């Protein structure tokens, strides 16, 4: 009935600020952690409990840790507006960064910080009674996010065992780039994400920039817009735990319906009524129209085209004014289309959810206010195409050992490059093989 | 037909305080000792638990014993504490230290003569004496050692009366003390020789009663002691009020014990239900009998379903037809026939009393002799064997003076008790 | 627009009073500014009990 969020490095903390801003404003907790309640025992709710616990003085505090190796971003959180919301132990900061080296984070520096993080997570897990997973936010392009995220997921996987770990990951975009060494860190990261995650959602900033230019009317977007979109997606997926509805969906139902084989756990995400205020005047927003919207590749938050692959499973979350009969009519119309294709071994391709709470509006936000929305997470073979562009960049750099001396000097064997590159080749072949129609006797 | 009660140690003194509250309520005795009741039926058997002092007042025939006075000051501070005779409180000056040997041999023998003097003074004052009733824990220090010492002396001095004990024994799951297995083993060794009939209670079973059946939000030891006080005051009800089919402690013993070592019994009391639920189901004899045999309502961790009933007894309080009692007890005997020992043709005694406990129109208390009690003793013996093989804490007991041979004798006697129960528990087709 | 509650089938019409009865609803806190669709679990989970 609760979930714990782990935020790592710069992207993960900045996305955390938008997430906790939204969850506070949606539940109604004030910035100092107070919330009035009812004075008579028995007339009270619980929806906050998924994300907040209350102190004996009536302050609310959230089930999150913020992990960074550089101080600046956590000190920014400490001096901002939400200073009193977080417990100070939860905001953990080291002395110096991992300098874009996965090896520095994993072997040298994250090894010092990891035990404090594990002690905080243990202290959180002891104050729970129905924990049903971990949410992790990180980028695989930078050094501390890759190295410490991998090390921490390995340790969590040993200590907690069967408990689920769901990752939201900012992967390196296919032509927008921020640092030279991104391919090495992303390749080395993906091996750990392969072994130690139950579902992984992939994001690219280039897609969210395209989405904010095309659908919203923003000439000069910045990271706060992208982070607000991510926060809305996470709020949509966790709303099924927190509010009344016709068809609830527990986090184990996602894994049961979405994952066909235990390695085939990388999923695409999209969100439907991303629309400006001017458009709201001229657009109807029926169930079938937003369902048709979620299938356009212009709606996706990862730069991949699903027409180059086959769908295995789709999970559609409706929140707001929807009637099950309209969902059924929409899904039957989608099923009729010939540009939408499912693997022939998956005839019953869809999972539905219906929740009564409509999406919340944030004071500075850019999305319009709408009475209904739908959010989809889906598993498709097209993702194999996403890995190939990173692997080509790895081969280009590695042919001349362009930067390897940093990694070897900071403690890593050269062999780890070849192992990881072979593992990504095998993952690509797995997604090719699972997606092949039918079979033959010879 | 007068009963003398003995309460020993903190647990015993607390249960006694709750018992004497319940008994004083049923007979309408004010905490000043003045009779304020509203029917003659109350007076005609008041002698059973109270002696009469001059000018109206009544005082309760009970001896209070403990090794440190903290509890006595607590009971004197309680709501009914004033009723007790000042001369009846006997206490020492230093604690038992949770040690059986300390409670039994060194500080025990110093006080025991003054306790025997008070008990004899109380016994010889009765015009006809019925059995003794003793409450104590077996896991403690002064409770176990002085309780079993006193039991042995009273059994020497009054061998023709009845000796009845209610005893609480440490959970394997919810213990307060590390050296519980030694004290428990030595006390069970003393009881199986000394006692005539012994009832055993697990605090874990009372917690499960409170949480599952009563749905109490914040239980306290007072609730646990009320459940115990309810069954203890229920067993004696036919002694002290009229009824269609009278019964007696000796009559219970004669019908329950087939052979003299098999005298350990399970207890239950049927009308238990939370204040929210009570509006949804009326009380009736089929309902009381069904709850009465439901293991959820039994006050030990061992379950009847792993053994077989040799004998059982049900005492009914209230205005009711005899036909329903007889036919219900027949139906329960017929429907669960595999759980009843086949070489006894009918295992259940019934009894009916007109006067129910206050605030219930009707109630039943259940006493059961079932072989599943062997599982409790086996568990205690297992924990003892783990501790004893390694000499884990023995120097305390040996420094007080105990021979290790005492420990081996007590282990052997409990093991033979377990074997005797085990042979009768399982079927033999041959 | 940041504070008004959207008009739904499950909230009913505010200016006529009509409200359809459907499954999946729970008792409602009467405090101001709280959503009526927040989960209620007092009947099945007595919080802070022991």
């Amino acid at each position: 009935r609760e979930a714990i969020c782990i935020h790592i490095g710069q992207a993960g903390c900045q996305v955390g600020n938008a997430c906790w801003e939204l969850f506070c404003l949606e539940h109604g907790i004030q910035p100092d952690g107070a919330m009035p309640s009812d004075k008579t025992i028995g007339v009270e709710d619980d929806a906050f409990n998924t994300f907040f616990s209350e102190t004996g003085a009536g302050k609310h505090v959230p089930r999150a840790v913020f992990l960074d190796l550089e101080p600046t971003v956590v000190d920014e959180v400490r001096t901002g507006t939400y200073r009193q919301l977080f417990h100070p132990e939860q905001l953990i900061s080291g002395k110096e960064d991992a300098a874009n080296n996965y090896a520095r984070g994993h072997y040298t520096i994250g090894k010092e910080i990891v035990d404090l993080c594990l002690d905080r997570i243990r202290k959180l897990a002891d104050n729970c009674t129905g924990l049903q997973g971990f949410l992790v936010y990180h980028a695989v392009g930078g050094g501390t996010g890759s190295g410490l995220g991998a090390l921490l997921l390995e340790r969590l996987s040993v200590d907690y065992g069967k408990k689920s770990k769901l990752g939201y990951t900012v992967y390196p975009s296919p032509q927008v780039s921020t640092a030279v060494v991104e391919p090495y860190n992303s390749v080395l990261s993906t091996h750990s994400l392969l072994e130690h995650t139950d579902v992984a959602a992939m994001l690219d900033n280039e897609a969210i920039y395209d989405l904010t230019r095309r659908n919203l009317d923003i000439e000069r977007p910045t990271y706060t817009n992208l982070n607000r979109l991510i926060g809305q997606v996470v709020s949509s997926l966790t709303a099924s735990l927190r509010f009344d509805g016709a068809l609830n969906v527990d986090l184990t139902e996602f894994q049961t319906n979405l994952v066909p084989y235990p390695r085939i756990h990388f999923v695409l995400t999209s969100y439907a009524p991303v629309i400006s205020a001017e458009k709201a005047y001229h657009e109807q927003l029926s169930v079938s129209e937003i369902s048709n919207a979620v299938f356009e590749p212009a709606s996706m938050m990862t730069k991949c085209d699903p027409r180059h692959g086959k769908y295995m499973a789709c999970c559609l979350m409706y929140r707001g004014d929807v009637v099950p009969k309209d969902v059924n009519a929409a899904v039957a119309t989608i099923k009729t289309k010939r540009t939408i294709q499912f693997v022939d071994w998956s005839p019953t391709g869809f999972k539905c959810g219906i929740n009564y709470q409509p999406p919340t509006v944030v004071p500075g936000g850019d999305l319009a206010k709408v009475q209904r929305a739908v959010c989809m997470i889906a598993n498709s073979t097209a993702i194999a195409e996403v890995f190939a562009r990173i692997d080509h960049k790895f081969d280009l750099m590695y042919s001349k050992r362009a930067f390897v001396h940093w990694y070897v000097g900071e403690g890593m064997e050269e062999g780890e490059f070849s192992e990881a590159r072979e593992d990504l080749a095998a993952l690509e072949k797995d997604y090719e093989e699972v997606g092949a129609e039918s079979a033959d006797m010879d | 037909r007068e009963i003398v009660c003995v309460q020993a140690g903190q647990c015993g003194n607390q249960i006694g305080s709750k018992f004497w509250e319940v008994i004083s309520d049923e007979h309408g005795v004010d905490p000043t000792g003045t009779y304020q009741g509203d029917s003659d039926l109350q007076l005609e058997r008041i002698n059973v638990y109270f002696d009469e002092a001059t000018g109206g007042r009544y005082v309760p025939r009970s001896v209070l014993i403990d090794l440190e006075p903290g509890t006595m000051d607590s009971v004197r501070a309680g709501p009914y504490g004033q009723i007790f005779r000042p001369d009846n409180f006997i206490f020492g000056q230093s604690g038992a230290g949770n040690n059986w040997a300390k409670g039994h041999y060194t500080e025990g023998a110093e006080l025991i003569d003054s306790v025997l003097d008070v008990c004899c003074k109380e016994a010889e004052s009765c015009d006809c004496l019925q059995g003794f009733q003793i409450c104590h824990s077996l896991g403690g220090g002064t409770g176990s050692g002085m309780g079993t010492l006193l039991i042995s002396k009273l059994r020497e001095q009054y061998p023709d009366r009845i000796m009845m004990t209610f005893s609480i024994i440490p959970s394997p799951k919810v213990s307060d003390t590390v050296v519980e297995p030694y004290n428990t083993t030595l006390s069970v060794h003393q009881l199986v020789e000394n006692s005539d009939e012994s009832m055993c209670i697990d605090n874990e079973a009372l917690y499960d009663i409170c949480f599952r059946t009563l749905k109490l939000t914040t239980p306290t030891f007072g609730d646990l002691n009320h459940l115990v006080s309810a069954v203890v005051s229920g067993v004696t009800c036919c002694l002290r009020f009229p009824g269609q089919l009278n019964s007696d402690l000796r009559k219970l013993a004669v019908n329950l014990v087939p052979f003299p070592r098999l005298h350990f019994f399970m207890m239950g009391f049927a009308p238990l239900t939370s204040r929210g639920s009570q509006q949804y189901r009326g009380l009736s004899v089929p309902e009381l009998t069904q709850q009465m045999f439901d293991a959820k309502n039994m006050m030990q961790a061992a379950d009847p379903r792993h053994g077989r009933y040799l004998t059982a007894s049900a005492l009914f309080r209230g205005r009711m037809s005899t036909k329903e009692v007889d036919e219900q007890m027949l139906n329960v005997q017929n429907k669960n026939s595999s759980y009843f020992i086949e070489w006894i043709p009918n295992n259940i005694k019934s009894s009916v009393c007109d006067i129910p406990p206050k605030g219930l129109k009707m109630a039943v208390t259940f006493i059961g002799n079932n072989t599943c009690i062997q599982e409790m003793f086996r568990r205690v013996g297992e924990q003892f064997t783990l501790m004893f093989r390694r000499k884990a804490f023995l120097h305390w007991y040996t420094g007080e003076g105990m021979d290790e041979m005492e420990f081996t004798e007590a282990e052997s006697n409990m093991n033979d008790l377990v074997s005797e129960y085990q042979q009768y528990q399982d079927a033999t087709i041959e | 627009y940041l504070s008004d509650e959207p008009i739904t089938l499950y909230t009913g019409n505010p200016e006529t009073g009509c409200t359809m009865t459907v499954h999946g609803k729970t008792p409602v806190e009467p405090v101001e500014g709280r959503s009526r669709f927040g989960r209620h679990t007092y009947f099945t989970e007595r919080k802070y009990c022991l």
Binding site: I41, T55, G56 | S74, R76, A77, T217, T218 | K47, Y48, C49, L50
Partner: peptide
Amino acid sequence: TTREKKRLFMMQRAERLKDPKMRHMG
């Protein structure tokens, strides 16, 4: 008197622990 003070302390404790939230984290 000692008895009056003991009774008063016990009564106030019972008044405090009646609320489960206060028993848990007051």
